[PDB]
Amino acid sequence: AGIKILLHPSGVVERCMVSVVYNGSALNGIWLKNVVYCPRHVIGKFRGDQWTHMVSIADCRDFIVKCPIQGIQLNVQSVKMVGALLQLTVHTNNTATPDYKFERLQPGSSMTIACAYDGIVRHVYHVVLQLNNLIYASFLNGACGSVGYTLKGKTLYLHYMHHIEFNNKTHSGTDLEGNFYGPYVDEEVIQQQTAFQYYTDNVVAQLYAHLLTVDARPKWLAQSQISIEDFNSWAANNSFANFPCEQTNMSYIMGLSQTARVPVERILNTIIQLTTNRDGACIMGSYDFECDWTPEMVYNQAPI
């Protein structure tokens, strides 16, 4: 009946979160099995290819690692740099380690962010990896090491770890394998970002979500339709990704079109019209086009 932004429970992540303090810097890390993962820039703000030598001479005793939930202080026996992350081997194996997987996220997919400070998850919110490989999140200093995750039956799927904030208040990081999303690095210098592009699949889901919870026949809904092929020709010149961005999203979108009794061609023409006729209309509780509603999460909460 009601379609909301669903988040995954953060208890599993909370039990694995730890604080990492190397001399001056203090950030967060995740502790899985006998390994603690955390951003590498905790040992200094370096650049390019000096990380190998800087990490290789980093003292294990300078790493103060504490698990606040379990009240356990950890001791680092080895240090390994995997990508832009540090893999700190510890003596104690985390008994709270769940069945986990390191899954890289494709753009347009959602994930829950466990924003943590001093090893304690303070806030939890929902983001979607945008087509520029950035997330639009909310972080302060000391929040690096916070993880983005999803769940699938007691199995924790870690997708992200926070590293850097850009001046436009966009955020970037790595997967849990150490590789950044996009062409961004953990350096405090000007880095060019590709122009913004709307994940059309998600924008379609947001409009469908409004039709199923707020107004089935709103005044901004197009009385006209446009083919997918004609929409994609318009989308190339209006910062909208080619539809569909994921072929698997078509089954969810077709299901939404049958439930709302509005074909996707009407939604796509509404998107085009809203580019010039929106005039501040609130759509699914937002004043602009959002990529935060995925077709799967909207279809999973819909009738029939």
Binding site: P39, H41, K45, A137, F139, A143, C144, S146, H162, H163, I164, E165, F166, N167, H171, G173, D186, E187, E188, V189, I190, Q191
Partner: peptide, 5 residues
């Protein structure tokens, strides 16, 4: 133009 968290 960018800052480490």
């Amino acid at each position: 133009x960018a800052v480490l968290x």
